[PDB]
């Protein structure tokens, strides 16, 4: 019977955590900080998708051409195969054309 | 699994409560009970 017999331990959430209370600060650092920075400079993550949105084929092409030189070898090989599959899928298979 | 189904016991019990007087495994097993409960309705 895939259901639990006891109620789970309670989930305490501090809404006035340091992350939650100061969340979203310096999102308008461009429009009222004399445009010295863009808010896409305010995001932190992978270096190939700071300030950029694409689908998966675009994320993997951009990932390869930006950081693909210093990727690990079977990560580079798996990523080449993913680009080759997603090429063959997006460009040849699908309903709408 | 990011979000897999937790509430599934109650869907099985939505169907199976109408089967509680059937014969065989129709009162017990969900695969058989859906057909006989649809058919009874």
């Amino acid at each position: 019977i895939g259901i639990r017999l006891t109620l789970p331990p309670p989930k305490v959430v501090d809404r006035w955590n340091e992350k939650r209370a100061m969340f979203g600060v310096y999102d308008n650092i461009g429009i009222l900080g004399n445009f010295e920075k863009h808010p896409k400079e305010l995001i932190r993550g992978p270096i190939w998708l700071r300030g950029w949105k694409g689908n998966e084929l675009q994320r993997c092409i951009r990932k390869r051409k930006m950081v693909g030189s210093r990727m690990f070898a079977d990560d580079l090989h798996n990523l080449n195969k993913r680009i080759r599959y997603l090429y063959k899928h997006f460009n040849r298979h699908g309903k709408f054309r | 699994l990011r979000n897999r189904v937790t509430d599934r016991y109650f869907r099985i019990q939505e169907v199976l409560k109408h089967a509680r007087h059937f014969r065989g495994r129709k009162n017990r097993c969900y695969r058989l009970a859906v057909r006989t409960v649809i058919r009874a309705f």
Binding site: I3, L7 | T6
Partner: peptide
């Protein structure tokens, strides 16, 4: 172990209802 609270709560209440209909209180 499926994360969540609501199926555990509803199933906790139906275990309470079966505990009532098994041993009815005076």
């Amino acid at each position: 172990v499926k994360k969540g609270f609501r199926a555990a709560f509803r199933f906790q209440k139906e275990l309470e209802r079966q505990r009532l209909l098994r041993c009815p209180p005076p």
